Design a protein. Structure first.
Lengths: 393, 223, 121, 127, 135, 223, 127
């Protein structure tokens, strides 16, 4: 065991795993940390927990969400810490307002809106106010979060629901924000297998769902719904499944539930946004994430020829490059069409979308319409008897 | 009809014949061009000193054999999964399972292709032929042409219940207008392995008479 | 009383005369009759004891069918033959419970009290 | 609604297990046991029977996946070899899987079946 | 500890469902009640075995009368109208206290002596504690 | 990634199966163009008089066979090692070792090519086919086209410990939320060669009850 | 840090062999014996055990050779079939070999392993 002489000396330092860099699913964890030592940047990228514990301290509620995010299969994540003090063991009502006023602050809105790599946000610190908070305090936190997902194009928010069933139905009805389609609420708190197996630590569910959103993005694309996939380190939802059967409403606002199937694991059950279905098109989570995937990949094509002469030539180079990409997304099973004129359509001409003054003002107007798919959440068996039509051979 | 997207070949390995334990999957990079299914039956011709009738008896129906080829690639810019990862996944399906001391049971399936009235091709791998070409100068292979050869091993609890719907133990028959009991007991021989005699058909139904049935009545023919 | 197990069970343990449960099968069905006559068959004056003992079947007759004093006829009501199938299952926890005071005594003499048995002379 | 089809398929308890003051438990007779034997199988999921661990249609393990022609062809394959294992008395004859015209998310399966050994229509609805 | 048989049934029978949502829930949930109390008597009497075979006996009480369901359970909520009546007929076990005098005759037989014969001037309540302290 | 240079084929001959004694190496002049690995398994179909179920049993898994060709040359100005030196080195690997009275164990390896989850191809030479062409007028050969054919002979102390990680003797299981003991003892049959019975699983863990486990508890299932 | 994993892997002496006045020699229990059984193997080189001649990772016979993709792929092959022979209780699951960003000469190997028969995480660090 000579550590300076050349040879094979084993070390305790953990080096990083080879990252796969999934581009369209990467979360932030905005919460209170104990250390806060980073002095260069605003929001920093972590890769492992052993890199996080050296970089943001130990033994807090936001660490066990990162520790459970790296167990379910997530490989990269950002952490934007709140600069205020870490709260008590239970959250007082004088202190719980200090969190939601820090979520409306521009100190955390500029770090998210300036980085332009993050595609979904989440607070694991909202379940810290689940005890001794007092109902509208939850809705004051959700309306802060859904507003935070409006600073820039591709942002989503996974958010925690209150465990009490009366409090959940009230915060579903009395939300009343005009940006409800950017959120999704997963109801029960998970009892993970971390100490204090006998008293496993009760945990936010959204840290596990952000890893399986990233996990179903790796193989089946953004068009696949993130429900019905197993969760790794959890024992049980702390509330029963049958107690939360009133959380799903097919006509009102429906809240996603986490079910326990015997022999099949703990599973996410439901891919619904917060939505009141008056002919709405952004009803499911996968429809909102697909249509925001084709904005954030058509802006990367339309950025390439900003400051171009705006003649009839540079529209046919835009109508050709975006038609060729949407067909490439359609032939992956993404857009619900039997032929390409049924799946999508684009128009760009000087007499179709824009006027003669909009060319003089210097703007192109592209009109992309696209069809999407449905997730098959209900299945109905009919069971009819058919010796009527055997027809005597 | 509904959508337009490639269905791809998946080979699911099961540890048991019934399909209850799962051993791992492998989705193909590119689908095979062609799928060849080969059936075969053995017939032995009976020799006899007296007669010269040409009549060949049935010996055995050999199991089906599916033969498909695949290609794996890492040259192209679109694909980045290495071929060491996929060929390790493929050889672990044509492998002696340490739990059951046999090979594993594969289920090839893709799309709406029924493999003669099964959605999958249940069977085990009889052969496997990797042909590495076009290595990098790091000696990582960039093209691999596997040739799989399977032989059909289907579950027994599925084949137990196809025999019961083809030749059941009990039949119910609807009479129609002046077919005799001698004529109706010949129609039982279509699906009762030698029909019931016209007396033993009348005894089982409790017939008062050999012609004592109305044309609306339902008869029962058990064996 | 369950001759399939109690041959194997009586050979290991001494199995003295005293039983912790002298509950006979005729004695059990009178206990379940007074239980079911409290449970209300819904919106009716008649109770659940009219269900479990429906048509010409008293608990003295069902004990006769169970102990095979009467030859078992092919037609018995299914909720009664469900009930007689339960008492065939419950002979197994009862028979392992009657064998325990014979094992409690032998534990007292040999383990604690240390007494041995005389060998052959 | 005759006594002949009872002799081929037997009498069993009706799946809505409603008990009556006369005749005891309502018995599902011969042609109606085999329909209700399909209603029990589609309604249970595998793992929640007590000791028969693998009994029940697992349509739960592929839902919340998008409706395409590859999911529909996986339902008709799964719903075919499951009725073969757990329903020996009913032979399937056609499966029609399509999504409903009203609500686009839900898709409706329709199983057409004949009983084995017998070609006898039911006269009218009942039990 | 006793875990109910109505838990292990498949959930389409509705025993762990919300109470009386459908009308077929209640006649089923009373059918499982007599076959539950027969199994709940078997789980008590193994837990009574340090009490049933102790040499320092002090009780009338034999085989058992405890309700099978915990008080928070949904199975308790179905029969909540007649749970006071069913517990009181479960208190028929005090009428079976003659059996306790047949175990004291068995437990005294370890030490070679039988129990006392029953007399006519017993005062059978006060007779029995003399027979208990004798053991 | 790090550098850019040819990895070349090396065949290391070992005197023993485990790979402890070394008998000599041979690095190839030019690498092979293609590498063909051929696997094969034998299945016998069970004949029975009564039933007609198609069910083929497993007999034997034949070992793998690698087939590569090499070329050696001395015409060109870049290369100066004679082919008598290299063909003497190659035939001494396909040679009866006088120490062990068998042939020697070869380990073909080059670069990052895994030969289905081994860095080398352990096996002995089954055939060898030298084809001399283009001699000098001194009769020194200047071109030689060897065709090697190997058959897989892998070490036994490696294959003893792959069976133990695939089907171990002892299992520890984490319970999760209302799986029964009847359901959990079926999950042991995935990796215990016939699962433990639900009683003998409860006896080994010392369960006070059949449902007397909390969902956090770890059970143990030995055989 | 339970008694269950001791029953699968046993108790042995800790590799830093530090002796205490209470409890004797510090014992490496079940999940921590298998980690320390890997630390003994990487730390000894073959030939310096007394009678077990070939025991220990020979990474000494290929060092002072230049870092390329052919040396890295020879480490991952050597470090894989060596844990198979001398560690029956730990199955390897990934090897990551890369040279460090700070000093270019040294390269750092990282062995990821699971224990056989058991999927039980360690709760926190210790022993």
């Amino acid at each position: 065991m000579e550590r300076l002489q050349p040879g094979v000396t084993l070390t305790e330092s953990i080096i990083t795993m080879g990252q796969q860099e999934i581009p369209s699913a990467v979360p932030v964890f905005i919460g209170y940390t104990v250390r806060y030592p980073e002095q260069s940047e605003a929001s920093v990228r972590i890769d492992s927990l052993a890199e996080y514990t050296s970089l943001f301290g130990d033994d807090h509620v936001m660490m066990f969400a990162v520790r459970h995010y790296f167990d379910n299969g997530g490989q990269q994540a950002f952490v934007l810490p709140l600069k205020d003090n870490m709260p008590s063991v239970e959250m007082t009502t004088a202190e719980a307002e200090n969190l939601i006023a820090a979520l409306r602050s521009a100190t955390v809105s500029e770090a998210i809106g300036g980085h332009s790599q993050i595609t979904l946000i989440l607070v694991p610190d909202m379940a810290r106010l689940n005890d001794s908070d007092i109902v509208s305090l939850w809705s004051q936190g959700w309306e802060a979060l859904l507003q935070l997902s409006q600073v820039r194009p591709n942002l989503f928010v996974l958010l925690d629901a209150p465990d009490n069933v009366e409090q959940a139905q009230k915060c579903m009805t009395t939300l009343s924000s005009d940006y409800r389609q950017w959120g999704a609420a997963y109801w029960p708190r998970l009892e993970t297998t971390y100490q204090k197996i006998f008293q496993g630590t009760v945990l936010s569910p959204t840290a596990a769902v952000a890893a399986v959103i990233q996990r179903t993005d790796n193989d089946a694309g953004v068009w696949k719904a993130p429900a019905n996939i197993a969760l790794s380190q959890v024992i049980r939802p702390v509330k029963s499944y049958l107690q939360g059967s009133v959380l799903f409403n097919s006509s009102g606002t429906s809240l996603n539930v986490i079910r326990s199937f015997p022999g099949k694991g703990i599973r996410v059950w439901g891919c619904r946004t917060l939505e009141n279905t008056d002919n709405t098109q952004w009803r499911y989570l996968q429809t909102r994430r697909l249509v925001s995937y084709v904005t954030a990949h058509l802006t990367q094509l339309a950025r390439m020829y900003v400051f171009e002469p705006n003649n009839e030539l540079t529209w046919m180079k835009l109508k050709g490059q975006s038609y060729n990409w949407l067909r490439q997304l359609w032939l992956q099973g993404g857009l619900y069409g039997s032929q390409e004129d049924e799946a999508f359509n684009i128009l760009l001409g000087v007499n179709e979308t824009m006027t003669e003054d909009d060319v003089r003002a210097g703007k192109m107007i592209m009109k992309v319409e696209l069809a999407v798919l449905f997730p098959a959440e209900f299945i109905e068996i009919s069971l009819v008897f058919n010796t009527q039509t055997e027809a005597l051979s | 009809l509904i959508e337009r997207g490639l269905a791809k070949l998946t080979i699911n390995a099961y540890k048991d014949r019934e399909g209850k334990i799962r051993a791992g999957t492998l989705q193909a990079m590119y689908n095979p061009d062609s799928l060849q299914l080969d059936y075969q039956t053995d017939y032995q011709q009976s020799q006899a000193i007296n007669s010269e009738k040409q009549s060949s008896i049935y010996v055995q129906a050999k199991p089906a054999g599916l033969s498909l080829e695949l290609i794996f690639d890492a040259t192209m810019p679109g694909n980045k999964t290495p071929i060491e990862e996929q060929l390790m996944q493929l050889k672990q399906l044509c492998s002696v399972d340490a739990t059951s001391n046999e090979t594993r049971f594969l289920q090839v399936k893709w799309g709406k292709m029924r493999w003669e009235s099964r959605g999958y091709f249940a069977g085990r791998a009889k052969s496997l032929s990797v042909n590495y070409t076009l290595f990098d100068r790091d000696a990582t292979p960039l093209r691999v042409r596997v040739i799989l050869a399977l032989v059909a091993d289907e579950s027994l609890v599925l084949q137990e219940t196809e025999q019961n719907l083809q030749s059941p133990a009990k039949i119910a028959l609807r009479i129609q207008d002046g077919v005799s009991l001698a004529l109706m007991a010949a129609s039982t021989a279509s699906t009762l392995s030698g029909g019931v005699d016209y007396l033993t058909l009348a005894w089982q139904n409790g017939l008062d008479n050999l012609n004592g049935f109305v044309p609306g009545e339902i008869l029962q023919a058990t064996r | 009383e369950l001759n399939e197990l109690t041959n194997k069970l009586s050979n290991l343990v001494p199995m003295t005369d005293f039983k912790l449960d002298n509950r006979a099968s005729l004695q059990l069905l009178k206990y379940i009759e007074a239980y079911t006559k409290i449970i209300p068959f819904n919106s009716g004056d008649k109770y659940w004891n009219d269900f479990f003992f429906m048509s010409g079947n008293t608990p003295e007759k069902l004990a006769k069918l169970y102990q095979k004093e009467i030859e078992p006829n092919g037609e018995l009501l299914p909720q009664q033959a469900f009930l007689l199938a339960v008492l065939r299952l419950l002979e197994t926890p009862i028979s392992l419970l009657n064998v325990l005071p014979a094992a409690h005594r032998e534990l007292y003499y040999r383990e604690l009290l240390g007494l041995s048995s005389h060998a052959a002379q | 609604e005759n006594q002949i089809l009872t002799q081929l398929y037997g009498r069993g308890w009706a799946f809505p297990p409603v008990f009556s003051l006369e005749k005891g438990v309502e018995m599902a007779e011969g042609a109606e046991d085999v329909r209700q034997s399909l209603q029990i199988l589609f309604s249970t999921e595998p793992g929640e029977r007590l000791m028969r661990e693998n009994y029940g249609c697992g349509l739960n393990d592929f839902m919340f996946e998008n409706i395409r022609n590859e999911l529909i062809a996986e339902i008709e394959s799964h719903i075919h070899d499951n009725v073969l294992r757990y329903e020996p008395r009913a032979d399937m004859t056609d499966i029609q899987v399509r999504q409903s015209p009203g609500m686009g998310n839900t898709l409706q399966v329709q199983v057409m079946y004949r009983l084995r050994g017998s070609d006898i229509n039911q006269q009218i609805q009942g039990v | 500890s006793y875990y109910p048989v109505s838990d292990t049934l498949p959930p389409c029978y509705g025993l762990q469902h919300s109470l009386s949502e459908s009308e077929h829930l209640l006649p089923l949930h009373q059918f499982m009640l007599p076959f539950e109390q027969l199994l709940a008597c078997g789980c008590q009497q193994i837990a009574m075995l340090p009490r049933l075979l102790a040499f320092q006996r002090e009780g009338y009480e034999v085989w058992g009368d405890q309700w099978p369901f915990k008080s928070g359970s949904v199975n308790d909520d179905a029969h909540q109208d007649y749970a006071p009546a069913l517990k009181d007929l479960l208190g028929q076990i005090a009428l079976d206290s003659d059996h306790e005098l047949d175990i004291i005759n068995y437990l005294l037989g370890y030490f070679g002596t039988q129990r006392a014969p029953r007399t006519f001037t017993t005062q059978l309540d006060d007779f029995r504690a003399v027979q208990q302290g004798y053991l």
